[PDB]
Ligand binder design. Structure first.
Ligand SMILES: [Mg+2]
Ligand SMILES: [Zn+2]
Ligand SMILES: [Zn+2]
Ligand SMILES: [Zn+2]
Ligand SMILES: [Zn+2]
Lengths: 138, 175, 170, 56
RNA sequence: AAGGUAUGUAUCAAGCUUACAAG
RNA sequence: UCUGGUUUCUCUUCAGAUCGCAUAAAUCUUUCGCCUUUUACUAAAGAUUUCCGUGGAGAGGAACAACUCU
């Protein structure tokens, strides 16, 4: 797999490498499978889902658990195994169970608003099982 | 020149000695990893010795890898059948291609087949995992004798008497 | 049976044809540009020599010619399907332009290449069993007593009303 | 370098995990090329170093 | 590249077009 | 003792500068040159644009910004 930094990366990369290899293999399966039956845009939800879980694995492995050091964390970001941007929206206050960056962009939406994934379900109406059309669900 | 090989390079070769001669199938291990792992694993188990080629549609395919000999018995080294592994540069345009045999969904076992010609009806339906090294495509064209007795399965089908592994990528053990 | 060489190196080139060489003309050292270069060179070396008559070859007594092809370029090929044929003189025998017509004047309606491609992809009177099936003059095989009763009905035949003239045979 | 009727190669299953071969990379020795040695073959060479360049 | 193998009618599908207003 | 800010992203007009230490294509008006007519053309002048880029300016954040220029 392409590494693009010729680094011989620091430690402990050996204990996250089988995990990240599993997530990359599942992302290849979630990238390659056909789009028949899957309607138009539910066939692109799983790449956002597994991108979310990959960035969240490095996220809670570094900030929460404090297992990995800072240098390997910056390495995993600078290679491509995480977002530099989405952890910066996970660090902010009101939102760290976030779906992905498309439900924050207030001009992806036509009415100049944030998507209904990002609405507190307790204070929405009771039964509507809406799934965000961009990102996949709330 | 102008001839353009037009398919990805191979890695890993298995010589396979049937009664029609020696056939040296070389594998696309990177382009189809689980099926090639299946095939070198079973050849390394010597799973396919005395296995016959039980179906010949001459001009279209010749199937093998059924140690029961009826057309349904195949036991992968995954326990359950595994997934199809298609590729846009592996298509059924010619003879010498080798592909796992499916019954619909992601159902690939030991039962595989050679092609005997052009097989464009099988595109995106079967997992091509190897070609046959030339000067030994004629030994697997020996396998297409018009002896078929039926719509399939001629009188004395060729049996696989041995199965070498000429090159082994991705470390394994038999059972 | 063709026995294999039994080695693990695969079948073909290592570059997978990415240096395919186009070797359909005379090779580099025997090419006429190289012969011209040899003649040029040897006329440059012998300059102070004045007719030492060691003869050296044909040309050398004192880059044009057949020119060398680029080895590294396959030529992009089309098919020029569109035939130059007077439609008139093909299907009529008369062109109004005479011999000034810019097309061929052919009259052969042989198929084109694409047409060959797109064909290339594609008793009985009584209706009983034959109880002595017996004959008359003119091939009429009838059952025996049934045709006797037929003669009792009408003296001529049943198939085409031919005159039996009394003649009845097996 | 590719024949016709061959669709242009699909960068997911073809060369995504294929490693590249080697660039040209004239080898620089230390003790003479000591300042430029760490960064001389890099996409933008000094990009995240405020001493030598503007910024990003 | 056009300038030459005419164009003008009458029946017979995909291409393209909205997936709508509606007791 | 007090004074206290570089990056990065978007807008905001001004550009008079080798805005660019190099250099595209178009339109118009004339003379060329090939030319049979028209676009493809030629290669000089004049005057115009488009395009690939840049310079100084207001504002909004965010990025260690609290390290400290002052
Ligand atoms: Mg005219
Ligand atoms: Zn969300
Ligand atoms: Zn999302
Ligand atoms: Zn949403
Ligand atoms: Zn004519």
């Amino acid at each position: 797999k392409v590494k693009r930094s010729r680094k011989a990366p620091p430690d402990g990369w050996e204990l996250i490498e089988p995990t990240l290899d599993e997530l990359d293999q599942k992302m290849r399966e979630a990238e390659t499978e056909p789009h028949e039956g899957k309607r138009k845009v539910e066939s692109l939800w799983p790449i956002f889902r597994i991108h979310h879980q990959k960035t969240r694995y490095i996220f809670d492995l570094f900030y929460k658990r404090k297992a990995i050091s800072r240098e390997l964390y910056e390495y995993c970001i600078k290679e491509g195994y995480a977002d530099k941007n989405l952890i910066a929206k996970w660090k902010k206050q009101g939102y760290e169970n976030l779906c992905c960056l498309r439900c924050i962009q207030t001009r992806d939406t036509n009415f100049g608003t944030n998507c209904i994934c990002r609405v507190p379900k307790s204070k929405l109406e009771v039964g509507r099982i809406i799934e965000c059309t961009h990102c996949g669900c709330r | 020149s102008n001839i353009y090989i037009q398919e990805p390079p191979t890695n890993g070769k298995v010589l396979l000695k049937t009664t029609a001669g020696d056939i040296d199938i070389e594998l696309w291990s990177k382009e189809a990893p689980k099926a090639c792992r299946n095939f070198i694993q079973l050849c390394l188990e010597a799973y396919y010795d005395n296995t016959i080629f039980h179906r010949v549609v001459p001009g279209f395919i010749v199937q093998g890898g059924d140690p029961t000999g009826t057309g349904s018995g195949g036991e992968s080294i995954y326990g359950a059948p595994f997934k199809d592994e298609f590729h846009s540069r592996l298509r059924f345009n010619r003879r010498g291609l080798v592909a796992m045999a499916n019954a619909g969904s992601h159902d690939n076992g030991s039962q595989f087949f050679f092609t005997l010609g052009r097989a464009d009806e099988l595109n995106n339906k079967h997992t091509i995992f190897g070609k046959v090294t030339g000067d030994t495509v004629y030994n697997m064209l020996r396998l297409s004798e018009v002896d078929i007795d039926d719509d399939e399965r001629p009188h004395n089908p060729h049996k696989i008497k041995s199965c070498e592994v000429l090159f082994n990528p991705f470390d394994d053990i038999i059972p | 049976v063709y026995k294999s060489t039994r080695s693990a190196k695969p079948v073909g080139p290592e570059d997978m044809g990415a240096t395919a060489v186009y070797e359909l003309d005379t090779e580099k050292e025997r090419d006429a540009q190289a012969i011209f270069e040899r003649s040029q060179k040897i006329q440059e070396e012998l300059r102070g020599k004045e007719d030492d008559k060691i003869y050296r070859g044909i040309n050398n007594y004192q880059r044009k010619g057949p020119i060398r092809a680029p080895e590294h370029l396959r030529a992009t090929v089309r098919w020029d399907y569109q035939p130059d044929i007077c439609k008139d003189y093909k299907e009529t025998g008369f062109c109004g332009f005479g011999d000034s017509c810019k097309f061929l004047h052919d009259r052969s309606d042989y198929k084109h290449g694409w047409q060959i491609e797109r064909e290339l992809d594609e008793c009985f009177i009584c209706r009983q069993s034959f109880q002595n099936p017996v004959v008359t003059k003119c091939r009429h095989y009838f059952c025996e007593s049934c045709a006797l009763q037929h003669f009792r009905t009408t003296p001529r035949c049943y198939v085409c009303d031919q005159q039996t003239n009394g003649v009845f045979n097996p | 370098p590719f024949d016709d009727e061959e669709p242009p190669l699909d960068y997911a299953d073809n060369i995504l995990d294929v490693e590249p071969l080697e660039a040209i990379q004239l080898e620089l020795d230390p003790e003479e090329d000591a300042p430029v040695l760490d960064w001389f073959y890099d996409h933008q060479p000094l990009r995240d170093s405020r001493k030598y360049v503007n910024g990003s």
